[PDB]
Design a protein around this ligand. Structure first.
Ligand SMILES: Cc1ncc(COP(=O)(O)O)c(CN[C@@H]2CONC2=O)c1O
Ligand SMILES: Cc1ncc(COP(=O)(O)O)c(CN[C@@H]2CONC2=O)c1O
Ligand SMILES: Cc1ncc(COP(=O)(O)O)c(CN[C@@H]2CONC2=O)c1O
Ligand SMILES: Cc1ncc(COP(=O)(O)O)c(CN[C@@H]2CONC2=O)c1O
Ligand SMILES: [K+]
Ligand SMILES: [K+]
Ligand SMILES: [K+]
Ligand SMILES: [K+]
Ligand code: NA
Ligand code: NA
Ligand code: NA
Ligand code: NA
Lengths: 431, 431, 431, 431
């Protein structure tokens, strides 16, 4: 049982609490789209862990390369190159759009964003960073300074030159023009304010293509192209954080491919490592050269370490070989339709949005007031668990509670259906 | 050969340069105290990679737990606990001094420092951080802001409330009292200045027990106890960064044990993961409770991930079981004596310092002027390599060039001797 | 003549240039609503100098108290009180609304704002300051940090915690709700963004009731009451900068009286000293007491100096006795109507706004496009001068050029007419 | 009497407290070296008010020009030049050393420092400012950020890039070299630390030649020349704040003349206006030209106002004509010798320092421990007052209490003697 009192005692005595509450179970094993508790109960992992296990848990191919490298080439002095690093860097150049040529292989999402923001600052000689008021880029310094969805209070001033603009949110619009939600006009208005505040040191804009922690907010048609122009005009770089969207989850290899807008710096992390700590930034040859002339530095312990790099390469291979990007569209379609059916059945479902296998379900009291459904979101999440389905709700100011759904790209039709099943039961049990 | 032109071509075209130069070889395999190039030449790893491979490369026991977990419990939603996490946290509490009870398991050294600085700020309601002018804590925001040995120029303002004090450096003293280098008086003097600058928001002092990047600078007798008192008097926390010193390298499990001064927050990383990305912060139950009441947040993708945690546990086990801490003293003694013999043979060796298996050799032009030996340091390093020994020299302002020597705790007497051999040959070949 | 080459030579060799260009004349004397050049030509002062000479130049009553005090009580140690200081402080308490009790007598507008912002910060324990994107509060540190109409570039980062929100501008609206410019909804929207950026340290909002440098922008009906509520809800103080509006210019003693919204801190300067350097902050007894308990400090050389204080008292007396506040309405009406007649005559006049004797005329190319009239504004200003009328145009981004009209409260009907005359002639001569 | 209860009642009800306590008397008139209370008691002003009345109170010549201008040319639009402004600017160029050519005429000391720091920042493209840990430059933003003797707590973060170094203090030395207080070596040591902290944006060093608020600390022989070299080497400007030292008080027109080291920017204030608000910055033609090309802005209400400028000119005239600079030396000698005699009489006098008519007397418990005499300083100050002598003691950390003595340059031999008399009586009455 999940009740080993030695276990729970040690947890209470020796663990630092870092956000949320701990699930009241002991996870013993994981395989595919499932995690198993101490009683052997299988829990369908609809969030791919912390939205990373793109190939599900313990993917045989992944298990193999990890073995293969643990015993042959593990960690090295950061000045020493090896094959997996060069291969992964090369691969990354080949599959990202034209204009992205050179990669830096790191360990975590925050780190990747830090490395990108530092390069932007160096190459521009400037320091001001603009992000979305509902963003999430990480817990470390610069990354947290550009993170507005949470964590800004009680921990001292943020980095100097931090600005946020509102993110385009079609579900709950706030900027109208001619009895119309004009999100491009909103963008124009936001920028005018920045311009007036800036000290003349705008360095970069950092953005997620789909705000995940912010509540599955997809940047609408033509927004990105518009943003990139605002940047170009100001001599700013555009940094695209594809930690959650990259590596086939939205139905394209990279979300940026959908819009055809290529960023100056692209960052990747969660999905790329598929559960293991591996991250990266990819930039153009011109930007890298200048950063280099300027003495760019981002020297860490695990930068260019062979093992993680070998893992990343394998992940790319399987995704490509097994056409998991296409699969994301097919299963996403199936999942999306199911969600829409639930919304037909239940008034508490106010919206279903997202793309491919990155979907969001917004819980509301009134599908007209779109009044946020406080508490409902949480019992639902609770019943899901009992029902055997791991869900994750994000709750932000002035919005309804949002379920972030992101199953493995290797998820099955049957699994999708089970999840749909369990979710329906949880909602009716919760009302 | 190391000359695969496809390889070097891809490296040049697709890699972001991040500090230094790339070694002109292709590392294909690694085992024990050695790395092997493409021609199969064995290079003795006197830096344990990037000072992390405590058990050398590809340690069978490590290879096994990694296999064991890759296929059984890999990565999880951050709210889900598992056995390796609770076991590692518990172990960490049991082997660190009394006053360190609760752990947070992360991925990198910088992250660990960020998590610690954020907790300090939260719990004190303050934001100013003091470090050593020769420190190195990481590349991300807060960590870099507290890093003064390098990286402060051309990348915008540092975090608000950043201060540094000089580190006690016996080899090249600068503060005398009564014809005596009074490093405690220096400490007093440094603090008075801080006090005068502070806005009344001193939150913490962050320090390495032995400044590694700063040039193997060991805090002298009674310094630490003195520092901790300066902190206590100011209501500041003392954060000890044991990324390089922790886990038996100095001859004690933790450097802080030698002085008997226990920090409020202890951070670990490199050695703990033994090449893999795993890091941690350990704090007292009182500090954790308050951070918790205050809503502390440090939620990342890989926090509490089972695989790395399982690796960390194994590393602790082997170190303990094979008495590798004691071994550090025995081999360190042997290595130290060899270095002293070289210094007898060569005038260019100005100092040999450090502890256990974290040693430093300062290259000088004149062992009286102690004039820094520019360039000499670099040919030596160069010949070492040709000779088949991987060394690392750090060069800081107003100091001679320093070789940072840190072989695996599992290093052999024969290996130590080979290294001593190769080093002697490299010096005579270089003069 | 205005051409003394010794004069112009010395000006060029020994004067620091600090903004704008120097008028090509030598002002020798001033009296009433006029300044006189070296040829004796009289220039009608429609800006009361730098918008300060409320009683016109060289007001006999002012000339007398200045004599009276220069020879009897001039400057003192800042711990020494005297009658004019206590009398002026008392008077200020008696004529400002209930809730404003205690005054601090300083020298300049910027200083007054600094003293107010410092008190706000002290009493709240916070540091973030919000202002209008088109504001003007001064050239010194905090004041400049809260100044967004100009001066933010090329001089380093601004104060930490600086935010701006757009000012309500009816002439050129940008926020619509239901085909309507909803400036209260804009206010709500602005604040939501602040809230998301804030580190949880909102200390105060600083505002001008009528943005003078920003282009004579009057806060519309119900705005202020709304702003004060946003502040109250956030535990922020509202600081009202009445440097240009205070002391009867808008037709009320204080602009804040019109709206019936009383600020936590009121600052005054230009008009209060009537050309001489005198400024002040007035706050409630509760705020002063706490600032005091908290050790508030604002100790300068001329704080509480008797001479300026005696001047300020006299100015208040004459304004009251000669009913100059009412006069401001009567002459303002006359001036406003004249301006409206010109706008009938000339398409280039796009708007006439303001209150009492603080009026603005916005020059436009097309009274529909409301396209800004670049250059036109400047010849007009130029011809005015030749015609013998001193005007001042402020030109801000995305707005037409604006003439800031503010004659002395003692201005005559005839003078108003002359100005109207000269202005009409200048416009036709300039097109 | 000084007891008008209406007066004291109004003071209590309507005055903001801003530091210290109010003297329990009502000052009614002032003339020469004396101030008179309500009972007509004459108080000898040994601090020239707030160290400004260089020509004593109500100087007939000053009274006259003030009359002369109040009635003829008072205040003007800031773009309008007049004779007093050009004359004063020209005069300032002629009497300051070669290299100081162009002046900016403002109102207060803080403002003058702000204008100088802003110019330094503009012209260097940098933002970091270094000052002395015991400095005093003003209460506004930048000025306060560079002020370390007091006021840094409880009012939010300081300006970004603020650093302090210890000031050379011969009375209580803390940096020895070869059993010697080597203040140049201290300077070297201080700078090394700065260099290590700097983000590579050192803009200027701001300093008082004699730290007045800091406790009458004179920069020792060769210090300044040394400082200026540290600046030059770093591409930093040296800003000299001569608010208390300028205009003949130290026995030279400007303190900087004594050392023969000319600053890049010189600021003046208190003494220049002789009780009235007038201040200035003087810089070289090269610096002004570049600031100008760069768009320097410092546009205030009273910049270039004729009245104050006319006052400043008169003050310069009298000082020169009546050889008040020489007088400062003669009377200073007399005052200094008297102080030394007291120190012979009383063990509580630990030091007498300063220059010309800017002298300091440090009160100590033990003339060996040099233990600070807490409380003694205050009764002495108290008895002085009763005795009829206005003194001012500054009390800083780790120092004895200091009397800042600065009588009018027009002080008489008899007055000096009276002061010496009263001071002796106060000390014996206080022990
Ligand atoms: C003492 C210390 N703390 C923290 C860190 C940061 O660790 P990460 O780089 O994994 O975040 C380092 C890095 N060590 C440097 C980094 O590279 N080589 C070194 O000697 C370090 O030496
Ligand atoms: C878009 C995005 N970027 C960067 C990061 C930072 O990654 P690390 O935590 O590995 O540094 C996150 C984290 N994801 C959050 C973190 O936890 N859950 C999330 O949804 C993220 O969502
Ligand atoms: C050296 C110096 N510089 C600048 C200033 C600022 O002048 P303002 O106060 O006029 O802006 C002061 C103030 N002198 C302090 C202030 O009060 N008493 C003193 O001894 C000063 O001593
Ligand atoms: C609203 C307001 N507040 C404060 C100030 C600062 O006053 P000082 O310049 O005296 O410090 C100004 C300056 N007025 C500007 C400054 O010059 N012309 C103007 O219209 C102002 O308009
Ligand atoms: K590495
Ligand atoms: K996790
Ligand atoms: K005063
Ligand atoms: K003026
Ligand atoms: Na590409
Ligand atoms: Na412990
Ligand atoms: Na009142
Ligand atoms: Na000169």
């Amino acid at each position: 049982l999940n009740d080993d009192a030695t276990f729970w005692r040690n947890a209470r005595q020796h663990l630092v609490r870092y956000g949320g509450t701990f699930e009241p179970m002991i996870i013993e094993r994981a395989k595919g789209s499932f995690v198993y508790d101490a009683d052997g109960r299988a829990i369908l992992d609809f969030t791919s862990g912390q939205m990373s296990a793109v190939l599900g848990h313990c993917h045989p191919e992944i298990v193999s390369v990890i073995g293969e490298y643990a015993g042959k080439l593990d960690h090295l002095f950061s000045g020493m190159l090896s094959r997996p690093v060069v291969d992964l860097a090369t691969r990354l150049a080949n599959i990202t759009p034209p204009g992205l040529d050179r990669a830096l292989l790191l360990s975590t999402g925050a780190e990747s964003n830090e490395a990108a923001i530092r390069m932007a600052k160096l190459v521009t000689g400037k320091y001001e960073i603009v992000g979305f008021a509902q963003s999430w880029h990480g817990m470390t310094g610069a990354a947290a300074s550009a993170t507005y969805s949470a964590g800004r209070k009680g921990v001292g001033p943020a980095a100097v030159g931090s600005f946020a603009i509102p993110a385009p949110f079609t579900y709950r619009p706030r900027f109208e023009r001619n009895g119309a939600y004009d999100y491009l006009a909103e963008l124009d208005y936001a920028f005018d304010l920045i311009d007036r505040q800036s000290s003349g040191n705008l360095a970069a804009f950092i953005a997620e293509p789909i705000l995940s922690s912010g509540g599955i907010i997809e940047l609408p048609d033509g927004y990105m192209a518009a943003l990139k122009r605002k940047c170009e005009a100001r001599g700013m770089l555009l940094i695209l954080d594809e930690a959650q969207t990259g590596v086939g989850r939205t139905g394209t290899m990279f979300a940026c491919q959908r819009d055809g807008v290529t960023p100056d710096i692209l960052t990747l992390s969660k999905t790329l490592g598929a559960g293991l700590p591996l991250a990266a930034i990819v930039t153009s040859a011109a930007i890298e050269e200048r950063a280099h002339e300027l003495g760019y530095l981002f020297y860490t312990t695990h930068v260019s370490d062979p093992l993680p790099a070998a893992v990343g390469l394998r992940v790319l291979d399987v995704v490509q070989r097994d056409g998991l990007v296409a699969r994301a569209n097919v299963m996403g379609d199936r999942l999306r339709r199911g969600l829409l059916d639930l919304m037909e059945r239940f008034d508490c479902i106010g919206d279903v949005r997202g793309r491919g296998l990155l979907l969001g379900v917004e819980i509301v009291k009134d599908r007209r007031t779109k009044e946020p459904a406080d508490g409902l979101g949480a019992k639902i999440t609770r019943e899901c668990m009992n029902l055997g389905l791991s869900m994750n709700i994000v709750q932000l100011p002035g919005m309804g509670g949002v379920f972030r759904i992101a199953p493995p790209l290797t998820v099955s039709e049957d699994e999708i259906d089970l999840g749909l099943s369990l979710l329906g039961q949880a909602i009716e049990r919760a009302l």
